[PDB]
Design a protein around this ligand. Sequence first.
Ligand code: ADP
Ligand code: ADP
Ligand code: MG
Ligand code: MG
Lengths: 220, 220
Amino acid sequence: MIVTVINQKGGVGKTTTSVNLSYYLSKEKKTGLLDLDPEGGATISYGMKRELKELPLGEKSVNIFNVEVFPAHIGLLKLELNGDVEEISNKIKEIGKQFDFLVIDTPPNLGTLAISAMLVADRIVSPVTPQPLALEAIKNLDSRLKSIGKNAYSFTNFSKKVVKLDNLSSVKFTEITIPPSRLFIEASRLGVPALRYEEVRIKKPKLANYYQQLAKVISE
Amino acid sequence: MIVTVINQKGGVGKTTTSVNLSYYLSKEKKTGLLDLDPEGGATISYGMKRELKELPLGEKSVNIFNVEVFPAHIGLLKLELNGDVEEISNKIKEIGKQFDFLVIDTPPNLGTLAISAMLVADRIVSPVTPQPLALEAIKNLDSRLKSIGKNAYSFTNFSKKVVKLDNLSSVKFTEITIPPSRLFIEASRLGVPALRYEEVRIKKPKLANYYQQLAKVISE
Ligand SMILES: Nc1ncnc2c1ncn2[C@@H]1O[C@H](COP(=O)(O)OP(=O)(O)O)[C@@H](O)[C@H]1O
Ligand SMILES: Nc1ncnc2c1ncn2[C@@H]1O[C@H](COP(=O)(O)OP(=O)(O)O)[C@@H](O)[C@H]1O
Ligand SMILES: [Mg+2]
Ligand SMILES: [Mg+2]
């Protein structure tokens, strides 16, 4: 199953979602994490660096913290500029064939890499926040989803209360809401997944429940 | 400079020393960490797994937490059994040529891999503890060092007080002593270097001083 995480708006928690969902799924599934953002947030979140090499898409991967991570590289930039959407899509499908779950992190846009990941996604996930900018972004994503005949799941981040915009018929907003937590900040400063950091940092871990619910929602 | 960490006695802190010294040196130097222990403690300490592949020595490396780590693999086992010491030594020298510092973690013995790493080491480091078993081990290491015409530095771990056995003329015991700290246990449970974990876990980091002093001692 290919799970593509999408949002025009930066800073909503796309990389956090990709990193921790892939880590959670890896506990029982052969899980891969494909970093399509040239800035490489997920790659850094697994303790690695962006490759200053124009790599072919999906050639290089490392098993870090139980996840097969494909690090970001400067080649993505060229793929963002000259990339042929059909080739990138077929390459992503071929990469996804070798995993039970392939979670894809995307740049903060609906550009070449993001739309290629969307077109072949088995599931599309878009985090949202109560901030007006994120609501506008999810409206635009609903329009694009209709443009490609697909649907997406959404969950709320940075909040105690769920977001549900019923007029976006292509977006299924779940009842999952992730509140602010400095665990995410500390774990991102380490460059480790927040779930794993919590598994040693606090007596009674809590963040795993949200990603369990997200995995259950998309697995249906 | 090739820095080889050596001890017959398991559990003295060899892997901890290798991991954190390489992480500290990486802050300003191109630093590599070669895991020659088939059990792969250092590899796990950088969030990776032992490769169930009979790899050639030094072919595979990943930059994790700023350190170029060569993960352990089952091939080491065969190298422990059939390894030709001259070839392993020359391969280690060739690997070390490409780093400002190459820190080598070794199995808990003086076997093929350990002696090969010792023969080409620019510096040899052996942690010791006040436990009688470790004192016996460092005596034996002094004998072997004389057998190959080399010297080593030693520092004390798991203790508030320095160990200094003046009859071991091939071992320079430093005044460095590392006390018990649950930071090491927590960081090893994450699979991250203890220095990096401390850099986010406590307000005023302390462990970096010991590795600064060790680096200063060996750099002379
Ligand atoms: N629930 C949360 N509570 C606190 N901080 C968070 C939360 N979710 C994400 N963050 C932090 O917000 C920052 C941006 O998140 P990120 O996943 O990089 O957003 P995006 O990938 O959408 O740009 C990161 O430093 C991350 O640690
Ligand atoms: N100063 C210390 N305080 C507390 N625990 C330590 C200290 N040094 C090492 N340890 C712990 O002891 C265990 C064994 O250390 P390790 O470096 O694996 O020994 P070796 O590699 O010599 O077998 C590890 O779990 C490590 O976290
Ligand atoms: Mg991001
Ligand atoms: Mg060890």
